[PDB]
């Protein structure tokens, strides 16, 4: 019995814990990438030149079959987020757009 | 800031195929859902579609199933939307606008639109 | 589908006086309902989310409420760019679905 609401709903919680963690968080010393929200996952702070990982969001439907996942994103050597994001280790695992669409 | 540009419209014959397109800017286009919305001329708004951020899932209006398919180019940021068997009561103008989040349930940015007539 | 209901269909309303408009769902919609706000010849506005949220750049004269089936939409004190026609939308379940629209004219 999903409906959009709900999801809407779950995805709105996991936004707000996400800035609250951001929030509760002591910035680092020196150079960093800021941690973030995407829209899509919690982002915390990360080493330049290093590759970020953040736990598969919760809110999810099938968050119960990718839990041990990581969305990846690199962090740039000046401190600012590359624009590649790899959620592969996220998705549905019955994903087939080609059929979706039939 | 944002900005959705609808292509594509134009005049169509009935039971033919017709694809509009929308380029995004002003916005990071992979992190969020996309609508399409149409208003016959007088008429009021009448949802079309929406799509996730990713493609992961596609939802449509009663008045469309089995005719169109939703899409986007995330590497083009171009959004699109595949009309067949098009019918005189699906003229109309075609709204591309961004989704609030990442599944499509909140208009809350809209283009311009684009005049779609189904005429012979 | 979720059928959405708007009354009046015209609502005839002096300037600087308060719209009070209506949007009954055929079924609850929870909170999950969005205002509009579209001028003839322009693209539509999104005023309200959450049935009572405030998008960015909207004005305080701008209230909504409600819950379940029954949601309204409140202007205060219309000004000149307050004529215009609105629209509700809920997101409760797919498919989504638009009222049919509330326009609101100046009254003389």
């Known amino acids: 019995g999903q409906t959009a609401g709900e999801l809407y709903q779950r995805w709105e919680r996991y936004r707000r814990e996400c800035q609250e963690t951001l929030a509760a968080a002591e910035p680092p010393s020196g150079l960093a990438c800021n941690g973030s929200f995407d829209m899509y996952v919690c982002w915390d702070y990360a080493a330049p030149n290093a590759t970020a990982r953040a736990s598969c969001p919760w809110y999810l439907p099938w968050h119960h079959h990718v839990a041990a996942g990581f969305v990846l994103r690199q962090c740039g050597s000046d401190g600012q987020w590359g624009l590649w994001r790899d959620h592969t280790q996220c998705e549905n695992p019955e994903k087939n757009e080609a059929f979706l669409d039939q | 800031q944002v900005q959705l540009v609808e292509s594509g419209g134009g005049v169509v014959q009935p039971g033919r195929s017709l694809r509009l397109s929308c380029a995004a800017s002003?916005?990071?286009?992979?992190?969020?859902?996309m609508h399409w919305v149409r208003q016959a001329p007088g008429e009021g708004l009448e949802w079309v579609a929406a799509?996730?951020?990713?493609?992961?899932?596609?939802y449509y209006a009663d008045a469309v199933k089995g005719r169109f398919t939703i899409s986007r180019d995330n590497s083009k940021n171009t959004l699109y939307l595949q009309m067949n068997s098009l019918r005189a009561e699906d003229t109309a103008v075609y709204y591309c606008?961004?989704?609030?989040?990442?599944?499509?349930?909140?208009?809350?940015?809209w283009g311009q639109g684009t005049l779609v007539t189904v005429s012979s | 589908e979720i059928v959405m209901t708007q009354s009046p269909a015209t609502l005839s309303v002096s300037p600087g006086e308060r719209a009070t408009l209506s949007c009954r769902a055929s079924?609850?919609?929870?909170?999950?309902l969005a205002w509009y706000q579209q001028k003839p010849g322009q693209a539509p506005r999104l005023l309200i989310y959450?049935?009572?949220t405030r998008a960015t750049g909207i004005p305080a004269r701008v209230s909504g409420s409600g819950s379940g089936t029954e949601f309204t939409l409140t202007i205060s004190s219309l000004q000149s760019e307050d004529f215009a026609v609105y629209y509700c939308?809920?997101?409760?379940?797919?498919?989504?679905?638009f009222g049919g629209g509330t326009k609101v004219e100046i009254k003389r």
């Open positions: 079924q609850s919609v929870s909170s999950n």
């Open positions: 959450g049935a009572a």
């Open positions: 002003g916005f990071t286009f992979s992190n969020y859902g």
């Open positions: 939308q809920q997101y409760n379940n797919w498919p989504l679905t």
């Open positions: 799509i996730w951020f990713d493609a992961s899932d596609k």
């Open positions: 606008a961004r989704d609030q989040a990442i599944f499509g349930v909140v208009p809350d940015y």
